[PDB]
Amino acid sequence: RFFTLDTKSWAKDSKGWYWKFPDVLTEVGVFGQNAQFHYLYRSGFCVHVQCNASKFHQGALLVA
Amino acid sequence: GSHENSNSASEGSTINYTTINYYKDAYAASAGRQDMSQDPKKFTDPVMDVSDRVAQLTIGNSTITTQEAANIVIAYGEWPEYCPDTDATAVDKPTRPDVSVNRFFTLDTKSWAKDSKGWYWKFPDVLTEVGVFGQNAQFHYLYRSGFCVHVQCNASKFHQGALLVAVLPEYVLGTIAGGTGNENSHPPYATTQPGQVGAVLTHPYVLDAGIPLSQLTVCPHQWINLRTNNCATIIVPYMNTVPFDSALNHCNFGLLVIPVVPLDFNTGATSEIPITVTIAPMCAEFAGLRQAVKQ
Amino acid sequence: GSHENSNSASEGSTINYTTINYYKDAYAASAGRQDMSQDPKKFTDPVMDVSDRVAQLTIGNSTITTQEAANIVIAYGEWPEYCPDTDATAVDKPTRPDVSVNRFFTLDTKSWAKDSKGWYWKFPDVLTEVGVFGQNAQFHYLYRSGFCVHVQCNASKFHQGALLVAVLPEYVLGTIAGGTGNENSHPPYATTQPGQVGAVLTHPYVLDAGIPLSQLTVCPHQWINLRTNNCATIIVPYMNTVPFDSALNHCNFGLLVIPVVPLDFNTGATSEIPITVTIAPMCAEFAGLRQAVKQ
Amino acid sequence: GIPTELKPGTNQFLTTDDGVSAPILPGFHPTPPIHIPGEVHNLLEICRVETILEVNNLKTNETTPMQRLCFPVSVQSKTGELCAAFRADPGRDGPWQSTILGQLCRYYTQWSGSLEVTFMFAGSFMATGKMLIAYTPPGGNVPADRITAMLGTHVIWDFGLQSSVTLVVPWISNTHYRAHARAGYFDYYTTGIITIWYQTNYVVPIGAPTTAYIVALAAAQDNFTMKLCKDTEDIEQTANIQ
Amino acid sequence: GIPTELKPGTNQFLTTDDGVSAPILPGFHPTPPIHIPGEVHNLLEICRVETILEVNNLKTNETTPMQRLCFPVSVQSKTGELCAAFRADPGRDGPWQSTILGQLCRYYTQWSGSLEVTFMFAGSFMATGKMLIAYTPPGGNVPADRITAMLGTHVIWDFGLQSSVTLVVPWISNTHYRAHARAGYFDYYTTGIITIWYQTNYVVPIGAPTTAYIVALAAAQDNFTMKLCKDTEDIEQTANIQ
Amino acid sequence: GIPTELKPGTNQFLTTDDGVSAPILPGFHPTPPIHIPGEVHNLLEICRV
Amino acid sequence: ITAMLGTHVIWDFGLQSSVTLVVPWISNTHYRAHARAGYFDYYTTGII
Amino acid sequence: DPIADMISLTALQVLPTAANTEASSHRVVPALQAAETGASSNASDKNLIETRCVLNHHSTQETAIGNFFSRAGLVSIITMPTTGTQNTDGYVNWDIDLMGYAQLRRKCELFTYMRFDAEFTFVVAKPNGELVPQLLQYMYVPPGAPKPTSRDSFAWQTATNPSVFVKMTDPPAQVSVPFMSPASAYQWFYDGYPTFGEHLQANDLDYGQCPNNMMGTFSIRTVGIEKSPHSITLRVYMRIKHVRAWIPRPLRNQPYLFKTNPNYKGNDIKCTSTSRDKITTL
Amino acid sequence: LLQYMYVPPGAPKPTSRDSFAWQTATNPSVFVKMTDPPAQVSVPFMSPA
Amino acid sequence: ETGASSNASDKNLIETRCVLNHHSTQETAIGNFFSRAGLVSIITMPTTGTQNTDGYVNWDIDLMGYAQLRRKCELFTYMRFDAEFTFVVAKPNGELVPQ
Ligand SMILES: CCCCCCCCCCCCC/C=C\[C@H](O)[C@H](N)CO
Ligand SMILES: CCCCCCCCCCCCC/C=C\[C@H](O)[C@H](N)CO
Ligand SMILES: [Cl-]
Ligand SMILES: [Cl-]
Ligand SMILES: [Cl-]
Ligand SMILES: [Cl-]
Ligand SMILES: [Cl-]
Ligand SMILES: [Cl-]
Ligand SMILES: [Cl-]
Ligand SMILES: [Cl-]
Ligand SMILES: [Cl-]
Ligand SMILES: [Cl-]
Ligand SMILES: [Cl-]
Ligand SMILES: [Cl-]
Ligand SMILES: [Cl-]
Ligand SMILES: [Cl-]
Ligand SMILES: [Cl-]
Ligand SMILES: [K+]
Ligand SMILES: [K+]
Ligand SMILES: [K+]
């Protein structure tokens, strides 16, 4: 299912961010719990990155 | 007229009644003649086989090997089963963890003494904080499951005593009412939901609830008579007036272990005679996902 | 006996009831069992198509071109239609002017301000004194017609606000009863039949009639949300307990335009934001010719 | 109007009258039923279930009731001793009152059928011995000695052999049905007496208790039925329930 | 005359009894019916119609009620803030009372089914942003932060995208039917909590308002039904109507 | 309700009236009969003795 | 109570004199190299 | 397909009469039972003794739960006195709780769950048994419906609630009630709490309270703007009908103390059976 | 107003006008006014013989 | 914005299970909602006073004097029906007399 992690703020001088998988969810909801009780894990992922701005703003994020 | 609406409380049973009626609603009808059905083989003989001692049951990554067994009881003659679509009400797709939850958990051990009163545990209270089962119980609003109860107690061929192991649905406890009976006291959360450590009966004769122990055998039960067997096993199907329920606010049933024939042995023989409880939920289903709640 | 007269209030509907009866008159019968019919698609989805913004509707010598449209609503899922012979009662041959009356009339324009309360108009009061339609309404005792309502409101992509445009059949107004509620006051002709200029609501929350604006959407309606559309259109069929009626003494329904989400914009942007109402009667029929009467 | 005449009974309210009264909520539909294990249709289903007999119902137990749930056997010094005795009358005050069977038939005026009592030996595994269990039909008081009791319906049980044994109390009556027996004229419906004697002796080796207990379980057989539904004397509204 | 006996109920007047009474005008024929648009046969037809939710039901609005019909969103300075919260209990005092649905189910003791809430953004066209709307089933109080609420049933909405969005409140109950929830024992039938959070932020360019509003509309879905017809607490004969 | 009119005799108790009165014990089954010699059906059988 | 959460067997003497615990191959890799302290503790099999 | 691990025995029988007995003689171990299993001896007459054939026609119809329960019993006594502390108001609101009278209660508590319809009969009279020409109104106020605050309360308009109007002289009023729980069945025992939260000793009166059994209020009043001069006694009888029951349990063997719980007098714990002097003497 | 109740052998007999036995939850009882016609019921063959 | 109610259901916004729903809609039929007798008038004929020491009373038929019923009817604009009127009469204190 969809888990929504902390939000970051984009500033004119921001360097960039990164997250590790599955580190990010090891302590969240039922997923995390299963990850803790089990030695082995395997999974795929759906990543959704969101960022709104007016038609008067500009910039480009590379999500990889 | 005579043609009506289907709103009688007994319209979904394989037992029909002959009635008389002139109102559009069926519940207005008389009680009628009583058909004469009977199922005396679900209480008097809800045993396994409708070399029995010798055995081995496996579920999940756990396996029990019982040999001084007294066969196995299937409560009310019914096997645990995931909730069917006709009975279901909640619309979200339930999660059915399987192996991580349907397995054997072994709770604290109690010690049987010549003067022991007896103990009890509540389900599912006992596992709400154990392993993956507990976690699912906390993250979900709704829960439903069956149970396999295995009570163990060894002793030499020179010891004697008899434990009655029974399952009592909706085990509501009462207080001694201030003794005189003029105080309307109530059992504290710690007594109604003792957790995995269970609790001790103060008045076993009346099961701390104003009812005769002498009649407890009308419930799914089994005996552990030291000279015959050293363990008991009971499969329990889900029982409630609703398909799913909170594992936190409602205990579907309690497990009682009472020494009806007190432990005895000649001094010099092992005096530490423990009793151990191992349980395995069966067909666990959860629904109504949200954040974890402990109570 | 059992054979009777056909005099029950529910004898002309495609919904039958099972009853019991011993009197010669049908209305003496019980209410009976209720069939279980339903038409949830005439209130929850009485929209056009059961590039929608883009459009152009023509009737008479008038044509509207709407592009920031929110589709079109057909009130209660029914199209306007000349009165059928089974429902008709008056025997004289009605006059059906067609083009000279079934066309688009554009009434006075109102100005939407950040503090506007809301407005309303009555039908057919609004046209009783306009063009050929009005003239026919004056010369005839009886009138019957449907309506096409088009409400218009433009604004830049930097303005915001939302108008609820609704049709309320038999829009009976009430007074604030002297405030204390001890005075049985009544609305003057000028408030009940404001003419083509319409009137202003003093207490929109209760629609100046002791009923919640919050529930007005249970009536044929449409929204004009500035960021989405700038016009609304609603086709309205004739609604009354009689086939024809006086266009002077009875207003079949009222049109309400209320700012549920107030107009707002940054200073410097156009502040004059008008709202214009254009309406077209449909299938106008008149009968009972005599001399002209204004009221 | 149609010619009618009111007959006796008119206006009366018979608590057991099975008639038709008007419904308060027209068109109401009850929450549908779901499957629940353990449904019972006839009380008899319950009467066939063994519950514990308080054979050890002594005045000295009342303060330590758990002790009533089983009686003892121990190494005898004398042969053919009597271990315990009690009436087979199920609806009678006594040991049977503790059983679901006895409590239920107290909701009926008469009964008929065979009963069964199962005895379970809870001594050590090393203990052995044989007991004579007899049912003496009406007429004779409690048999004075084992040789007298032996003349009635009996079973000879051995522990080492099986831990439990079942004595059957055959329906042996003059009447097709018995009303609850009690002292007085109704002693006519007494069922009889059950006696437990030492056939041999409770033998045990060095190292094991010289006293052990037996649990008595009782229930009805398939031919058991009851009739004439009545109120039970076993419950009271001593004071007001608040 | 024919033998008859009067039974209990005789002479009583049950307000909901559906019987046959004698007609006062024999041979009378009612004015025939004509076609009238908008006929309804079942209340449920109405409950499926969205009406406005007074989410902004503050004590400070009571004198300017129109303000209760919509709540605001504005440029946030902090991430993941909570915009609004309210119970999903439809028959409960609160936001739902303003909807035709809530008013109607107050004429019934119990209900069952899924509900839907549609949110409409009425800000300027140049405003964009994403919101997280969640429904937290029974058990947990109001989620403290967005990361907690996110664990429940939710939808992630974007304005620029579509002006309206629909959150569905799935029927997730233990019982097949819920009675109206209120504080006390009946809190057992609570439906849960709805929370609206800022997924990203209300962004707007120079020239447009930094605060706009949202209108919440609510109604029932096709699986919705109600039972046990009762009187509503929402109307009173405070004084005499003249 | 159905149109009815009470006629004379209403409310009276005729000792020899052979009607139907409500049963006090629903579902009750009497002890079955057994064969007993000497059954008589009509007093005349006795008058011939 | 903690150990019980893993793969286990509950044995009784009176019953049978011998009992067999099975150590299922539960690894990430298809093969394990001999485990020892240090980096190779990665190939540890577990605890009984 | 690319994964291989992803690819009730007892029934009813109709017995109208008791089972028969067949003949046997002087002749496999059916006398000794293994009651340690939790099973009831399947040994009958023919096994332990020599028997005769008996054609048993004894009927089991009277022990059907329906004939056992469908007998009207007292579940409530409501009084409206004219002089006193009770209700010199002329009306009374009674929370529906049928557990105030033992005879009926003990019968129901034989089962854990029960589902049924019911016939309620209202026997009303003066406290001495006399009757007078007094008009009364009984009204059912479901959970959520406004309760009358007076004899004049608008709630007596009863536009939607069901009400009954009857004279104290008319026969007892009588009506049928459907199965109204929001659950599949009423339950006499609910081993739990109605809500979430910590269960401090202050809110322990919560334990055992099941909302699914709470059917609302029953209101009654004399029908008049003015006070009535007569004291009134209302006895409510209930007859269960169309019943189904589940999970039998031990029968109460201690006097009842409270409607809402199984509390018992701890100092005077009664023994289920009477006592005697010796185990060897009758 | 009167109450007649059948108390079969074994059933508790009322010890007073207030006795709990008048709850008549299982025994059959009849409630009738001295002004109503005579109460009347049918009784089956109840002997155990 | 169209004036339509969301045609989006469970299966669209979440993963669901199959549920065979047998809940009946018969009780919400307008007939079962309205066919419940309600108070529409209270007429008094006192012997001592200002009202009607005349022994008779003429009442203009208007059923809108009592809210419970009125609010229910005003849910609709137009209604067509037959009706059953019941006349409950007694003394002001609830007593009855041979009148
Ligand atoms: C105008 C006639 C009104 C009559 C309405 C009576 C409705 C009564 C319904 C029966 C409900 C069964 C009792 C249910 C639960 C128990 O009382 C609970 N233990 C109380 O907490
Ligand atoms: C001898 C029996 C006489 C009973 C006759 C009663 C007839 C009443 C007919 C019902 C009419 C429905 C009410 C109609 C309209 C409303 O009261 C109006 N708002 C009053 O202006
Ligand atoms: Cl950041
Ligand atoms: Cl029957
Ligand atoms: Cl331990
Ligand atoms: Cl311990
Ligand atoms: Cl004790
Ligand atoms: Cl109906
Ligand atoms: Cl203009
Ligand atoms: Cl203007
Ligand atoms: Cl306002
Ligand atoms: Cl007896
Ligand atoms: Cl955040
Ligand atoms: Cl609610
Ligand atoms: Cl009134
Ligand atoms: Cl029944
Ligand atoms: Cl009484
Ligand atoms: K006549
Ligand atoms: K006659
Ligand atoms: K009638």
Side-chain angles (χ1 to χ4, degrees), chain E residues 167-186:
Chain E
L167 167 66
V168 167
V169 184
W171 172 252
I172 300 181
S173 179
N174 44 352
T175 57
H176 265 259
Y177 281 90
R178 284 198 231 256
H180 299 319
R182 60 170 166 290
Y185 298 142
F186 280 64

PDB file of all heavy atoms in Angstrom, chain E residues 167-186:
ATOM      1  N   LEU E 167     -13.804  11.015  -1.548  1.00  0.00           N
ATOM      2  CA  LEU E 167     -13.268  10.085  -0.575  1.00  0.00           C
ATOM      3  C   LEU E 167     -14.394   9.115  -0.296  1.00  0.00           C
ATOM      4  O   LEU E 167     -15.542   9.518  -0.113  1.00  0.00           O
ATOM      5  CB  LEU E 167     -12.918  10.788   0.734  1.00  0.00           C
ATOM      6  CG  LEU E 167     -12.646   9.801   1.876  1.00  0.00           C
ATOM      7  CD1 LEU E 167     -11.378   8.999   1.573  1.00  0.00           C
ATOM      8  CD2 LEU E 167     -12.509  10.548   3.187  1.00  0.00           C
ATOM      9  N   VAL E 168     -14.080   7.837  -0.266  1.00  0.00           N
ATOM     10  CA  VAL E 168     -15.114   6.873   0.021  1.00  0.00           C
ATOM     11  C   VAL E 168     -14.901   6.352   1.423  1.00  0.00           C
ATOM     12  O   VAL E 168     -13.779   6.046   1.808  1.00  0.00           O
ATOM     13  CB  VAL E 168     -15.072   5.711  -0.973  1.00  0.00           C
ATOM     14  CG1 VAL E 168     -15.941   4.578  -0.478  1.00  0.00           C
ATOM     15  CG2 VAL E 168     -15.575   6.188  -2.323  1.00  0.00           C
ATOM     16  N   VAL E 169     -15.975   6.280   2.196  1.00  0.00           N
ATOM     17  CA  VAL E 169     -15.888   5.761   3.547  1.00  0.00           C
ATOM     18  C   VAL E 169     -16.510   4.376   3.510  1.00  0.00           C
ATOM     19  O   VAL E 169     -17.722   4.209   3.676  1.00  0.00           O
ATOM     20  CB  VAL E 169     -16.648   6.634   4.539  1.00  0.00           C
ATOM     21  CG1 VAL E 169     -16.434   6.108   5.949  1.00  0.00           C
ATOM     22  CG2 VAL E 169     -16.159   8.062   4.435  1.00  0.00           C
ATOM     23  N   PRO E 170     -15.672   3.359   3.281  1.00  0.00           N
ATOM     24  CA  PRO E 170     -16.093   1.967   3.202  1.00  0.00           C
ATOM     25  C   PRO E 170     -16.771   1.536   4.474  1.00  0.00           C
ATOM     26  O   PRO E 170     -16.402   1.965   5.571  1.00  0.00           O
ATOM     27  CB  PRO E 170     -14.779   1.218   2.989  1.00  0.00           C
ATOM     28  CG  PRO E 170     -13.876   2.246   2.399  1.00  0.00           C
ATOM     29  CD  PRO E 170     -14.208   3.451   3.212  1.00  0.00           C
ATOM     30  N   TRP E 171     -17.777   0.689   4.327  1.00  0.00           N
ATOM     31  CA  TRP E 171     -18.456   0.196   5.497  1.00  0.00           C
ATOM     32  C   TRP E 171     -17.484  -0.772   6.134  1.00  0.00           C
ATOM     33  O   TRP E 171     -17.227  -1.846   5.599  1.00  0.00           O
ATOM     34  CB  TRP E 171     -19.742  -0.519   5.111  1.00  0.00           C
ATOM     35  CG  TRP E 171     -20.412  -1.239   6.249  1.00  0.00           C
ATOM     36  CD1 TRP E 171     -20.481  -2.592   6.430  1.00  0.00           C
ATOM     37  CD2 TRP E 171     -21.149  -0.650   7.333  1.00  0.00           C
ATOM     38  NE1 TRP E 171     -21.219  -2.882   7.555  1.00  0.00           N
ATOM     39  CE2 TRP E 171     -21.641  -1.712   8.129  1.00  0.00           C
ATOM     40  CE3 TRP E 171     -21.442   0.667   7.708  1.00  0.00           C
ATOM     41  CZ2 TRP E 171     -22.412  -1.496   9.278  1.00  0.00           C
ATOM     42  CZ3 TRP E 171     -22.212   0.882   8.854  1.00  0.00           C
ATOM     43  CH2 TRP E 171     -22.687  -0.198   9.623  1.00  0.00           C
ATOM     44  N   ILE E 172     -16.901  -0.364   7.252  1.00  0.00           N
ATOM     45  CA  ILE E 172     -15.976  -1.224   7.965  1.00  0.00           C
ATOM     46  C   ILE E 172     -16.473  -1.267   9.394  1.00  0.00           C
ATOM     47  O   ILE E 172     -16.146  -0.413  10.215  1.00  0.00           O
ATOM     48  CB  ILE E 172     -14.555  -0.676   7.910  1.00  0.00           C
ATOM     49  CG1 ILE E 172     -14.109  -0.591   6.456  1.00  0.00           C
ATOM     50  CG2 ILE E 172     -13.612  -1.590   8.664  1.00  0.00           C
ATOM     51  CD1 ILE E 172     -12.713  -0.078   6.293  1.00  0.00           C
ATOM     52  N   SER E 173     -17.296  -2.271   9.668  1.00  0.00           N
ATOM     53  CA  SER E 173     -17.893  -2.446  10.980  1.00  0.00           C
ATOM     54  C   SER E 173     -17.770  -3.890  11.425  1.00  0.00           C
ATOM     55  O   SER E 173     -17.447  -4.787  10.640  1.00  0.00           O
ATOM     56  CB  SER E 173     -19.384  -2.060  10.926  1.00  0.00           C
ATOM     57  OG  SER E 173     -20.021  -2.230  12.182  1.00  0.00           O
ATOM     58  N   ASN E 174     -18.021  -4.110  12.703  1.00  0.00           N
ATOM     59  CA  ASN E 174     -17.989  -5.451  13.235  1.00  0.00           C
ATOM     60  C   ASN E 174     -19.406  -5.979  13.027  1.00  0.00           C
ATOM     61  O   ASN E 174     -19.601  -7.074  12.494  1.00  0.00           O
ATOM     62  CB  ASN E 174     -17.603  -5.411  14.713  1.00  0.00           C
ATOM     63  CG  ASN E 174     -18.319  -4.318  15.486  1.00  0.00           C
ATOM     64  OD1 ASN E 174     -19.015  -3.463  14.917  1.00  0.00           O
ATOM     65  ND2 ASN E 174     -18.142  -4.337  16.801  1.00  0.00           N
ATOM     66  N   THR E 175     -20.382  -5.160  13.418  1.00  0.00           N
ATOM     67  CA  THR E 175     -21.804  -5.471  13.278  1.00  0.00           C
ATOM     68  C   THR E 175     -22.294  -5.106  11.874  1.00  0.00           C
ATOM     69  O   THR E 175     -21.757  -4.199  11.237  1.00  0.00           O
ATOM     70  CB  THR E 175     -22.667  -4.661  14.278  1.00  0.00           C
ATOM     71  OG1 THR E 175     -22.432  -3.261  14.079  1.00  0.00           O
ATOM     72  CG2 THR E 175     -22.332  -5.032  15.721  1.00  0.00           C
ATOM     73  N   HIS E 176     -23.325  -5.812  11.416  1.00  0.00           N
ATOM     74  CA  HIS E 176     -23.933  -5.592  10.102  1.00  0.00           C
ATOM     75  C   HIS E 176     -24.602  -4.227  10.025  1.00  0.00           C
ATOM     76  O   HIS E 176     -24.774  -3.658   8.939  1.00  0.00           O
ATOM     77  CB  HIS E 176     -24.991  -6.662   9.837  1.00  0.00           C
ATOM     78  CG  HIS E 176     -24.487  -7.834   9.058  1.00  0.00           C
ATOM     79  ND1 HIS E 176     -24.717  -7.979   7.706  1.00  0.00           N
ATOM     80  CD2 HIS E 176     -23.768  -8.915   9.438  1.00  0.00           C
ATOM     81  CE1 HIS E 176     -24.164  -9.105   7.288  1.00  0.00           C
ATOM     82  NE2 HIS E 176     -23.583  -9.690   8.320  1.00  0.00           N
ATOM     83  N   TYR E 177     -24.999  -3.722  11.189  1.00  0.00           N
ATOM     84  CA  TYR E 177     -25.658  -2.432  11.290  1.00  0.00           C
ATOM     85  C   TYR E 177     -25.118  -1.651  12.472  1.00  0.00           C
ATOM     86  O   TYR E 177     -24.713  -2.235  13.477  1.00  0.00           O
ATOM     87  CB  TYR E 177     -27.164  -2.603  11.506  1.00  0.00           C
ATOM     88  CG  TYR E 177     -27.974  -2.928  10.274  1.00  0.00           C
ATOM     89  CD1 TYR E 177     -28.196  -4.251   9.882  1.00  0.00           C
ATOM     90  CD2 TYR E 177     -28.553  -1.910   9.516  1.00  0.00           C
ATOM     91  CE1 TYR E 177     -28.985  -4.549   8.766  1.00  0.00           C
ATOM     92  CE2 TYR E 177     -29.339  -2.195   8.398  1.00  0.00           C
ATOM     93  CZ  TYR E 177     -29.555  -3.513   8.031  1.00  0.00           C
ATOM     94  OH  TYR E 177     -30.358  -3.786   6.944  1.00  0.00           O
ATOM     95  N   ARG E 178     -25.128  -0.327  12.343  1.00  0.00           N
ATOM     96  CA  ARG E 178     -24.698   0.559  13.418  1.00  0.00           C
ATOM     97  C   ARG E 178     -25.907   1.364  13.902  1.00  0.00           C
ATOM     98  O   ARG E 178     -26.783   1.735  13.112  1.00  0.00           O
ATOM     99  CB  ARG E 178     -23.610   1.541  12.944  1.00  0.00           C
ATOM    100  CG  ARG E 178     -22.213   0.939  12.777  1.00  0.00           C
ATOM    101  CD  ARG E 178     -21.155   2.038  12.744  1.00  0.00           C
ATOM    102  NE  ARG E 178     -20.246   1.942  11.601  1.00  0.00           N
ATOM    103  CZ  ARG E 178     -18.994   1.501  11.668  1.00  0.00           C
ATOM    104  NH1 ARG E 178     -18.482   1.106  12.832  1.00  0.00           N
ATOM    105  NH2 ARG E 178     -18.255   1.462  10.567  1.00  0.00           N
ATOM    106  N   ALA E 179     -25.971   1.597  15.205  1.00  0.00           N
ATOM    107  CA  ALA E 179     -27.039   2.409  15.777  1.00  0.00           C
ATOM    108  C   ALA E 179     -26.375   3.784  15.805  1.00  0.00           C
ATOM    109  O   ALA E 179     -25.162   3.874  15.633  1.00  0.00           O
ATOM    110  CB  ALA E 179     -27.367   1.943  17.194  1.00  0.00           C
ATOM    111  N   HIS E 180     -27.131   4.856  16.011  1.00  0.00           N
ATOM    112  CA  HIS E 180     -26.491   6.164  16.025  1.00  0.00           C
ATOM    113  C   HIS E 180     -25.501   6.261  17.160  1.00  0.00           C
ATOM    114  O   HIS E 180     -25.828   5.984  18.316  1.00  0.00           O
ATOM    115  CB  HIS E 180     -27.526   7.271  16.131  1.00  0.00           C
ATOM    116  CG  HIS E 180     -28.471   7.292  14.979  1.00  0.00           C
ATOM    117  ND1 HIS E 180     -28.054   7.076  13.683  1.00  0.00           N
ATOM    118  CD2 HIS E 180     -29.811   7.458  14.923  1.00  0.00           C
ATOM    119  CE1 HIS E 180     -29.098   7.102  12.878  1.00  0.00           C
ATOM    120  NE2 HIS E 180     -30.178   7.332  13.605  1.00  0.00           N
ATOM    121  N   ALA E 181     -24.282   6.650  16.811  1.00  0.00           N
ATOM    122  CA  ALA E 181     -23.210   6.785  17.783  1.00  0.00           C
ATOM    123  C   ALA E 181     -23.279   8.099  18.537  1.00  0.00           C
ATOM    124  O   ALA E 181     -23.626   9.142  17.985  1.00  0.00           O
ATOM    125  CB  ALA E 181     -21.858   6.671  17.094  1.00  0.00           C
ATOM    126  N   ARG E 182     -22.948   8.022  19.816  1.00  0.00           N
ATOM    127  CA  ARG E 182     -22.918   9.178  20.686  1.00  0.00           C
ATOM    128  C   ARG E 182     -22.007   8.800  21.837  1.00  0.00           C
ATOM    129  O   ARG E 182     -21.626   7.635  21.972  1.00  0.00           O
ATOM    130  CB  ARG E 182     -24.321   9.525  21.193  1.00  0.00           C
ATOM    131  CG  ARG E 182     -25.006   8.454  21.988  1.00  0.00           C
ATOM    132  CD  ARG E 182     -26.259   9.013  22.634  1.00  0.00           C
ATOM    133  NE  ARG E 182     -27.119   7.950  23.143  1.00  0.00           N
ATOM    134  CZ  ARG E 182     -27.800   7.107  22.370  1.00  0.00           C
ATOM    135  NH1 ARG E 182     -27.735   7.207  21.043  1.00  0.00           N
ATOM    136  NH2 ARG E 182     -28.554   6.169  22.927  1.00  0.00           N
ATOM    137  N   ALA E 183     -21.633   9.775  22.654  1.00  0.00           N
ATOM    138  CA  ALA E 183     -20.760   9.492  23.783  1.00  0.00           C
ATOM    139  C   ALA E 183     -21.406   8.447  24.684  1.00  0.00           C
ATOM    140  O   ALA E 183     -22.635   8.383  24.813  1.00  0.00           O
ATOM    141  CB  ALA E 183     -20.497  10.754  24.559  1.00  0.00           C
ATOM    142  N   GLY E 184     -20.571   7.621  25.302  1.00  0.00           N
ATOM    143  CA  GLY E 184     -21.094   6.593  26.174  1.00  0.00           C
ATOM    144  C   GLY E 184     -21.000   5.233  25.522  1.00  0.00           C
ATOM    145  O   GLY E 184     -20.208   5.026  24.604  1.00  0.00           O
ATOM    146  N   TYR E 185     -21.818   4.301  25.989  1.00  0.00           N
ATOM    147  CA  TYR E 185     -21.800   2.957  25.444  1.00  0.00           C
ATOM    148  C   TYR E 185     -21.963   2.935  23.926  1.00  0.00           C
ATOM    149  O   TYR E 185     -21.361   2.108  23.240  1.00  0.00           O
ATOM    150  CB  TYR E 185     -22.897   2.113  26.102  1.00  0.00           C
ATOM    151  CG  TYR E 185     -22.728   1.956  27.598  1.00  0.00           C
ATOM    152  CD1 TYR E 185     -23.830   1.967  28.453  1.00  0.00           C
ATOM    153  CD2 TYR E 185     -21.462   1.775  28.158  1.00  0.00           C
ATOM    154  CE1 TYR E 185     -23.674   1.801  29.836  1.00  0.00           C
ATOM    155  CE2 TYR E 185     -21.292   1.611  29.535  1.00  0.00           C
ATOM    156  CZ  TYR E 185     -22.401   1.625  30.368  1.00  0.00           C
ATOM    157  OH  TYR E 185     -22.227   1.476  31.727  1.00  0.00           O
ATOM    158  N   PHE E 186     -22.759   3.850  23.393  1.00  0.00           N
ATOM    159  CA  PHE E 186     -22.979   3.862  21.959  1.00  0.00           C
ATOM    160  C   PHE E 186     -21.834   4.362  21.102  1.00  0.00           C
ATOM    161  O   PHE E 186     -21.967   4.469  19.879  1.00  0.00           O
ATOM    162  CB  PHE E 186     -24.254   4.625  21.641  1.00  0.00           C
ATOM    163  CG  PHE E 186     -25.488   3.814  21.863  1.00  0.00           C
ATOM    164  CD1 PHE E 186     -25.815   3.366  23.135  1.00  0.00           C
ATOM    165  CD2 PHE E 186     -26.309   3.465  20.794  1.00  0.00           C
ATOM    166  CE1 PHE E 186     -26.941   2.579  23.342  1.00  0.00           C
ATOM    167  CE2 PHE E 186     -27.440   2.677  20.989  1.00  0.00           C
ATOM    168  CZ  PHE E 186     -27.758   2.233  22.265  1.00  0.00           C
TER     169      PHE E 186
END
